[model samples]
Target chain A: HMAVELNHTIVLVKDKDASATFMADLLGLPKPKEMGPFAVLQLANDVSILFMDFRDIVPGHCAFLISDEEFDQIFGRIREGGIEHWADQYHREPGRINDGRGVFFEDPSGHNMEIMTRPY
Target chain B: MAVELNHTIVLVKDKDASATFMADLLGLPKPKEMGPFAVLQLANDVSILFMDFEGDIVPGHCAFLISDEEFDQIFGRIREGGIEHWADQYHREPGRINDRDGGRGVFFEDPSGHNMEIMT
Candidate 1:
């Protein structure tokens, strides 16, 4: 059987450039590339997140896996930016997850963004 | 300096059922429950964690990259199951597949109305 993988996802945002830049800066990725109406953030696995301008956005969730070192770096950036983060999705907890060292925050478009050192 | 997608939380009416539906459609393994999530594993170790939500769900877009053979088989199953599909995301052209970007592509909806796309 041939393997199937996620190629890309279209994330609706109010300001494509701002949303894309926020993600790129947080994840230590280079500037997003413009493809037609999309500001595409390319990932390490050849997957991409294409940000497109839209109205009345319904929030979405996106998570990334990173090394422990990367996690520290990103967490630092998040704190530096004064972006409120939670240990869980509910935004009640303030610290990292006990198991995965994960943190959740919202983007400018109100999309839930998460990063973790572990899969779970 | 490699970062990858670990997992994404997908809001659904029935977490287990939605995860099973996606697994069956894409010929993937059964989902495993961890906490409140029905986690479906992808080929690249990425995961889609289905979570039950009571509020209204605005459809999210997730695109998959598959081999030509896998696309053929999955598309066959889609047709056999009488699932409505379209050639594009806009839902302008129904019951057709598109050969854009030098690949075959189709768009369909999951049980919870998430826009799912498969392409070679």
Candidate 2:
């Protein structure tokens, strides 16, 4: 068996710089680097999310796993930023889930963003 | 400082079958059921949670980074299974692969129209 992993993903955004900066600030990640037409945010595991500008976009979902302490800080940032979030993906319930301390929110491009302390 | 991609929710028409198709094609283990999700785990501790959706689903893209040897096996399975593939994201150059960035890559679609890419 050969080693396989997710290296990167392309995220469609209305404004690449705005979206990338928004996500980086929320997650406390480093500033995104410009790679050609993309604003790329590199994650801890060497994976990257390339934010590309596009019009007439349909929303997509990206979830992150974080430590309990990091979750506190990020979730605090979510609240401080006044970003509406929910405990579930359907946006039915408000606040975070107790089981995994997960919350579902949307990015500037309406892409679903999620963060959880535990894997589900 | 302690954040990484844990999983993503992939909207599909038939979550069960779609998960199975991806797992089998990628030579991964069987997907597990969690709540309403058909969870497929990747080698890098990331998961793709397939969920059934009734609304119109705009296809998304998910790219995987694999070793050259794994690419050989997976690409072989793709050909042997008669799956349609392309050399580029635009769906041009059908039935072909690309050698760019000093690596090999191919693009294919899933049952739900999501573009799947395997690259070295």
Candidate 3:
């Protein structure tokens, strides 16, 4: 079948390696590979999250749909890292997750990353 | 699966047009209305949610990996649409493609100036 998948996106960050490492570490993925000028993080589905150096950026939202079991380990890492998370996207109110519970956290690059058990 | 990319928020000038453009270009299923998003979904269960942007956008970059035949058909739509493309990211070289990884690929943009790429 001719299936087209999102292989990657050119993520703008202050430090490519640092950003990729942070993502891989949080998501419990393998270490990112340095290819050409990119620090590439290969996802389980073969999607590559490549990073490049760029200072100016607004918060970009990326959501990961993981299992409930996966959320425990991920949230555990987040808590251990002392990363602040919000229950809502607006960053207002202490936002807590519900049915398809999810939490939002800012990455090293200031991008908003969402981890959720359900598709929203 | 424990890990998955459920959805990605894509900022664009016009949500409807951009979503339709992407779906038509990729020949995927049509986008559907869900809350405030024009969700363009792929067969892999990943959704690209196109949202309207209020201010200046940094112009996000998204790349897709597809089969050779899929690339051919998609590029054909791009040709029919007469979309301007570049071989590199800098917009320095126009109308060029790359096979560095043994696949044909090109970079182009939607009306919102979002950098999009397709590869085989």
Question: Where does the lowest 10-residue lDDT sum fall in candidate 2 chain A?
Answer: A52-61
2 versus 3: better TM-score goes to: 3
Q: Model 3 segments beyond 4 Å from truth?
A: A56-60, A118-120, B54-60
Candidate 2 lDDT for residue B112: 69
Residue B120 accuracy (lDDT) in model 2: 91
**Where is model 2 more than 4 Å wrong at Cα?**
A13-15, A34-38, A53-60, A95-100, B54-60
Q: Could you give candidate 3's per-residue lDDT for residues B1-120 as a string of tens digits?
A: 246677777777888888888887888778898877888876566777788872122333688888888888878778788899887666667877777667688888877677888887
Clashing pairs in 3: A87-A95
Best by lDDT: 1
Model 1: per-residue lDDT, tens digit, B1-120?
377876767667788777888888888888899877898887776777778872222234678888898899999999999999999877779999999988899998878766788999
RMSD of 3: 3.2
lDDT of 1 by residue, A22-74 (tens): 99988889989998778999888768888888762112368888988888888
Q: Estimate each model's TM-score.
A: 0.86, 0.84, 0.85
Per prediction, the TM-score for chain B is: 0.89, 0.89, 0.87
Which of the two, 1 or 2, has more DockQ? 1
Q: Residue pairs in steric clash, candidate 1?
A: none
Query: Model 1 segments beyond 4 Å from truth?
Result: A54-60, A95-100, B54-60
Candidate 1 CAPRI grade: medium
Greater lDDT among 1 and 3 belongs to: 1
lDDT of 2 by residue, A39-87 (tens): 9888776577887777621223688888888888888888888888888
